Ligand binder design. Structure first.
Ligand SMILES: O=C(Nc1ccccc1)C1CC1
Length: 191
């Protein structure tokens, strides 16, 4: 989670798409879905990003519908967005013990127990937080076995990005869980 705003230049693909769905949250606008292999994923837009501006116009108080109408109405040449980094999220770094544990329990993305003497404990990991990202990779919609797989496959150091469930549940509403499994971008970024 970087401090401060950045700017991104987007460009519609052949099909006039950018691979984004936006959601109005507390009078701002937030990224709900990034489509795999899209302009939005190429430029490094991420779930939970706040969009301040589109083409220099402020986003404050827009409908989802309004934000999506703008992205459509804009010319494809150059869409500039002003983006604040995943403001509802926090990243926590942990280290696995020799038994390959960082020391929490989760169910459906949502952390539900911290284990005594664990790294998760030492690091102050919280329950009632949904897991958004593991080691820079979005894992929203993946099944618990697959997250467990990712954590089990990771090195010693594990980096987790997490969002308070109540905010997480507000963002993902109006999106059926198979889009999230099948469509949300779950790839390591390109270089
Ligand atoms: O940062 C957040 N939660 C959190 C904080 C500390 C440890 C673990 C999680 C919420 C505001 C976005």
């Amino acid at each position: 989670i970087k401090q401060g705003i950045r700017e991104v230049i987007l460009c519609k693909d052949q099909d006039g798409k950018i691979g984004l769905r936006l959601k109005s949250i507390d009078n701002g606008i937030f990224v709900q879905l990034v489509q795999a292999n899209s302009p939005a994923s190429l430029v490094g837009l991420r779930f939970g990003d706040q969009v301040l501006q589109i083409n220099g116009e402020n986003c404050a108080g827009w409908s989802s519908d309004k934000a999506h109408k703008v992205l459509k109405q804009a010319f494809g040449e150059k869409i500039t967005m002003t983006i604040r980094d995943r403001p509802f999220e926090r990243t926590i770094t942990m280290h696995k013990d020799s038994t390959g544990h960082v020391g929490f329990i989760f169910k459906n993305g949502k952390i539900t127990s911290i284990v005594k003497d664990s790294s998760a404990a030492r690091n102050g990991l919280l329950t009632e937080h949904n897991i958004c990202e593991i080691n820079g990779q979005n894992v929203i919609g993946l099944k618990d076995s697959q997250i467990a797989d990712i954590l089990s496959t990771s090195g010693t150091v594990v980096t987790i990005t997490i969002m308070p469930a109540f905010i997480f549940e507000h963002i993902i509403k109006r999106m059926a869980p198979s889009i999230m499994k099948s469509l949300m971008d779950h790839t390591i970024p390109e270089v």
